[PDB]
Paper text:
Multiple transcription factors can bind together to a regulatory element in a cooperative way, and cooperation between the pioneer transcription factors [name] (also known as POU5F1) and SOX2 is important for pluripotency and reprogramming. Here we present cryo-electron microscopy structures of human [name] bound to a nucleosome containing human LIN28B or [name] DNA sequences, both of which bear multiple binding sites for [name]. Our structural and biochemistry data reveal that binding of [name] induces changes to the nucleosome structure, repositions the nucleosomal DNA and facilitates cooperative binding of additional [name] and of SOX2 to their internal binding sites. [name] has two DNA-binding domains: [name]-POUS and [name]-POUHD.
The initial cryo-EM reconstructions of the [name] nucleosome in complex with [name] showed a density near the linker DNA, similar to the density of [name] bound to LIN28B DNA. Focused classification and refinements improved the resolution to 2.3 Å in the nucleosome portion and to 8.1 Å for an approximately 20-kDa [name] region bound to the linker DNA. We performed MNase sequencing to determine the position of the [name] DNA on the [name]-bound nucleosome and combined that information with the cryo-EM map to build a model for [name] bound to the [name] nucleosome. [name] binding to OBS1 on LIN28B or [name] nucleosomes stabilizes the positioning of nucleosomal DNA, to expose internal TF-binding sites, thereby facilitating binding of additional [name] and of SOX2.
Author numbering:
A (entry chain F): 21 to 101
B (entry chain H), G (entry chain D): 29 to 122
C (entry chain G), H (entry chain C): 11 to 118
D (entry chain E): 38 to 133
E (entry chain B): 22 to 102
F (entry chain A): 38 to 134
Write the structure that this text describes.
DNA sequence: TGTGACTATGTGCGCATGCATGTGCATGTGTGTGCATATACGTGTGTGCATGCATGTGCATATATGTGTGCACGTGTGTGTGCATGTGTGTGTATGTGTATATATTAACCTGTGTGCATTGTGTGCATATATTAGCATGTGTGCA
DNA sequence: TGCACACATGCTAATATATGCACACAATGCACACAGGTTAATATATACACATACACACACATGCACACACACGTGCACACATATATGCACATGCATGCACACACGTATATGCACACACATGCACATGCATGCGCACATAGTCACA
C-alpha cells in the first residue's frame, strides 16, 4: 500500500513501455506525464471495481470486478474470466 | 394509436425550475431522447449487476450502484441523494 | 376501494413511477423488479432532467429568449463539465458547437 | 572502447520488446500503487492475485497503445522524440 | 443517381471546417473530406437498411437511422430516439 | 478597392458559423447522395423525410468534430492550414481506420 | 462447486482445424472470454431487435440480423451461411 | 420414449445448443426464445471459434510451436483485417503487440 | 503610430406567421385488492486464500560521464491559398397527385412454455507425459570505425 | 575490410503444465399439455415519390497577391549509451486470520388476476414568441500620415 508509490513506476519501466509502442526517442518530461496518465487511468478502473465489490457486499476485489469495470469503460479484457 | 413520451413530465419539471420559460418541440424531442437514453443505460447496468451477483430481481440497491457507475463525480452524489430521499419518502407513505 | 394515489405523488415526484415500473418489467432487464427500484430510477431521471433544464433555461435567458431551443440545450450540456462527460458521445440535433478559436489562429 | 550510436540500442530494444509479451512494469511496485489508490475508496481492501494481474495487463496495454498514438503525433510534427504535448494531443483526440 | 458525391461542394466543406474552427484549408482537403463522408454514410446506411429488412419494410425511417447511429457509438438526440 | 487581408474574413466565418446551428450542406444534393449510397444495399428504397434529416445531422456533426481534431493536428505541426495527412492522423488516433 | 465454461467445446473445434495442436490454459481462458463476449454482443443486439419490432421472441431471424450488424462484411457472410445451414439441418432432422 | 440425442448432434455442431438455449432464456433477453435461435447462435459461435483457432494454429506453426499461447491468438487477430475490427476494443492478456516500426525511425 | 474611410456585426423597431400552449373526449393503463409463490436473507458452517513475515540471490535500478545529434531557431522563397468579382444554375419553396405502403383489425394455429421424469454429458479431482524452459558452444549477422 | 557485439541455433536435462481418465450429478432431452404470440388476410389511411413552377441566393470560375509552408542552415543542450555501485524485486516458504462460499430455513416481497377509475395522448383552437426586414449606431479592419 504505502504512500507515494507512483514513483515505483520507474523511468526504465516507462522506457520499456515506450519501446513496445515503437518509440525511438523519449524526452525527459515524458516520465512525469506518463505517471499522471497512469494514475488517472487506474483511479477510474479501481473506483468502478470497488463499486462492483461494494455492491456484492465483499471486502476483496476480484478479477471479475476488474474485468467488469474495464468492460464498463469500453476496454474489455480477455483471459481473466 | 397513442405514442407515449416524457414530454408532459419534462414540462412539469421545466415549470418548477423556470416557470416563465417555454420549450420548443425540437428541444422537447431532445429531452425525450435524453430521458430514454439515461433510462436504458441505468436499467442495462442494473440488469448486469443483478446477473453478476446471481440475483433475479432489480432493486433500488442495483439502481443506486448503476447510478454511481454511470454518473460522474458530483452528478452521482446528488442523484443518489434524490433517489434515496424519494425511496425513503415513498415507503413512509406506503 | 380507497382513493387511488399515484406512486409518483407518494414519492413526491413529477416523473411517472408506474410507467417506469412497467418499462422495467417489459424491458427484459430482470424477471422481477423491486418496489423501490422504479421510485429510485424515476427520481434520478427527474433530477437529471432538472439539471439540464435549469442550465438550458439560463442559456435561453442569456440570449434574450423565453423558449428553450436545441441550441440552449447544447450550450448547457457542453459548458457543464459533468454533463459533458455523461453526454460525451451524444449528438444534439440543431445544437451547433461551442464558440472556440485557437489562440494561435488569432491575429497578433 | 566500443560504443553504439544514439538510437541503435533504442531500435534493438524496440524489436526486443515488440517480440515478447511479459509485463514491463515490476509487479511489486505496481501492486503497492494499486493498493494505495484503492485506499481512497475503501479502507482495508483485499485483492485477489489475479485482480492485480488483470489491472497490470490492462494498464500496460493502455500505456503501450497510448505511446503508439503518441509516437504518431511526434512523427507528424517531423520529430522522432515524444514530448508531453504529443501525449496531450493523443489523449485529446481519443476523447480523454 | 450517379456521382452525387460532388454535390458536397467546396463551399459546403469550407463551412463545415469554419464551424470546426479551421482558418486555412489546403486544396486537397475537399477530395479527402468527400471520401471520409462517403465511408461514414455507407456504415450508417448499411446498418439502417439492415434494420429496415428485419422490420420487413421498404421505407428507411428516422428510428432506423437512430438505431444504426446508436450501434456505432454515435447516439443522436432529437429524432424520436 | 477595399480588400481584407488573408485570414481576416476566414476568422469572421468561424465566428459566424460557430454561432449558428443550421445545416451547412445543401439538403437536396445530400438527399441524392444518401439515395445513391443506399442503392448498393437495396433497390426501390424509400426514405422518410426525417430519416434523411437525421442522416444529415449526424453527418455534419461527425465532419465538424473531425475538423476540430484535424485542426489540432495541424496546429501541433506548427501550421495553420489543415492537410489530408492531418485528417488521416486524426482518424488513425480516433480508431476510424 | 461446478464452474461452466466453453473450454471442452473449444477443444473439440481445435482438434478439427488443427488435430495435432494443443492450447495453453491461459489461451483457453481467452477463448472462453471471446465466446462469452460474442454471445453477449449477439444476444444483446437480438434482444434490442425484438424490442424495436414489438416482438417478445428471439428467433433465428433476429440472430441472423444481429450477426449482420455486428460482424464485419465477409465474416458476416460466412457466419450467416453457417447459421442457416445448421438451422436447416436441425429442422430437417427434427 | 427413445434414446436421447443432443440438439448439437441434430444441428451437426460441437458447441452446446442446449446450453445456449438456457443461457438465452436465463440471460433476460426476451420473454420467449425460438427453437432455431440457439441453433443459429451456436453455429455462429462455433464458426468464429474455428476461424480464430485455425489462424492461431498457423501462427503457432510459424513459430515452431505445437501449443497455442496468448501470443498466437493476438497475432491471428491483429493480422486478420476483419477479426481486428471485431476485437478492436479488446485487450488480449499476454498477447503483446505486432512488430511495427515506423520507417522514419529506421537508420538512414 | 494615430487617423480617417470602408465594411460588417449588432441593436432596437415594427409586423406578420406558424408554432407552442391550453382545453376537452376517451381510453388505455396504472392502481387497489387479495392471493399464492419463490426469491432473498439471516444464521451457521468449513475452507480456501489473501496478508504478513522472514531469507536468500542477483537482476534491475540509479547515478554519473561523455557526446552525438536531434530540436529549435532564424532565413528566405516560391506558390498555393484567400479574397473579391461577375454570372448563371441549381436549390428551396410551394403546389398538387397518384401510388405504394405502413398500419391496424380479426381469426386461428402453430410454436414456445411448463411440468415431470429419465439420464447422459460435464466438471471435478487425480495420474501421466508431453512440450516448454533453462544452459552452453556455435553461427551467423549487423553495426561501426 | 576486419573487429566486436548481439541475437539466433542444435543441443541436452529438467519440470511443470497440459492431456487424458474415472465418477457423480446437475443440467439436457423427452413427452406431453396448454395457451398466447405470431402470422395472414383484409382494409385504410398515410406520406412518399413524382412532376411542375418560380425566383434568387449560392456555387463556379476567374484574377490578384499575400503570407504561409517548406526547404535550408546554424548551434546547443538534451537525451542516448555506458559503467558502476546498490537497492530491492522475485521467489520460497511458513503461519494465521478471515473472508467467501455453501447450505438451509423462512418470512418478506413480488408477481398474478381483476375491477375501475383517471391520468395521458390525440385533436381542437388560439395567441404569442420567433422570424423578417428596415434603418441606425458601432466595433473593427486596413492603408496612410
Amino acid at each position: 500500500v504505502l504512500r507515494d508509490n507512483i514513483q515505483g513506476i520507474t523511468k526504465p519501466a516507462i522506457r520499456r513501455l515506450a519501446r513496445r509502442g515503437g518509440v525511438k526517442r523519449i524526452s525527459g518530461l515524458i516520465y512525469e506525464e506518463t505517471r499522471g496518465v497512469l494514475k488517472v487511468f487506474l483511479e477510474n478502473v479501481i473506483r468502478d471495481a470497488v463499486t462492483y465489490t461494494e455492491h456484492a457486499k465483499r471486502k476483496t476485489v476480484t478479477a471479475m470486478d476488474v474485468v467488469y469495470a474495464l468492460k464498463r469503460q469500453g476496454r474489455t479484457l480477455y483471459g481473466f474470466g | 394509436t397513442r405514442k407515449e413520451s416524457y414530454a408532459i413530465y419534462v414540462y412539469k419539471v421545466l415549470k418548477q425550475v423556470h416557470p416563465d420559460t417555454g420549450i420548443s418541440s425540437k428541444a422537447m424531442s431532445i429531452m425525450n431522447s435524453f430521458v430514454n437514453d439515461v433510462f436504458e443505460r441505468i436499467a442495462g447496468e442494473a440488469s448486469r449487476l443483478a446477473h453478476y451477483n446471481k440475483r433475479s430481481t432489480i432493486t433500488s440497491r442495483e439502481i443506486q450502484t448503476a447510478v454511481r457507475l454511470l454518473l460522474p463525480g458530483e452528478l452521482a452524489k446528488h442523484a443518489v441523494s434524490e433517489g434515496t430521499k424519494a425511496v425513503t419518502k415513498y415507503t413512509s407513505a406506503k | 376501494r380507497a382513493k387511488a394515489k399515484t406512486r409518483s405523488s407518494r414519492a413526491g415526484l413529477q416523473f411517472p413511477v408506474g410507467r417506469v415500473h412497467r418499462l422495467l418489467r417489459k424491458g427484459n432487464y430482470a424477471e422481477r423488479v423491486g418496489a423501490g427500484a422504479p421510485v429510485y430510477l424515476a427520481a434520478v431521471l427527474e433530477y437529471l432532467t432538472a439539471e439540464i433544464l435549469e442550465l438550458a433555461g439560463n442559456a435561453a435567458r442569456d440570449n434574450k429568449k423565453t423558449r428553450i431551443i436545441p441550441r440552449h440545450l447544447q450550450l448547457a450540456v457542453r459548458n457543464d463539465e459533468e454533463l459533458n462527460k455523461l453526454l460525451g458521445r451524444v449528438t444534439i440535433a440543431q445544437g451547433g458547437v461551442l464558440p472556440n478559436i485557437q489562440s494561435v489562429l488569432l491575429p497578433k | 572502447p566500443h560504443r553504439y550510436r544514439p538510437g541503435t540500442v533504442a531500435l534493438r530494444e524496440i524489436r526486443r520488446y515488440q517480440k515478447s509479451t511479459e509485463l514491463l512494469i515490476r509487479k511489486l511496485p505496481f501492486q503497492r500503487l494499486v493498493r494505495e489508490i484503492a485506499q481512497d475508496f475503501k479502507t482495508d481492501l483485499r485483492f485477489q492475485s489475479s485482480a492485480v494481474m488483470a489491472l497490470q495487463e490492462a494498464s500496460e496495454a493502455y500505456l503501450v497503445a497510448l505511446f503508439e498514438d503518441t509516437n504518431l503525433c511526434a512523427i507528424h510534427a517531423k520529430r522522432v522524440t515524444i514530448m508531453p504535448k504529443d501525449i496531450q494531443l493523443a489523449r485529446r483526440i481519443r476523447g480523454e
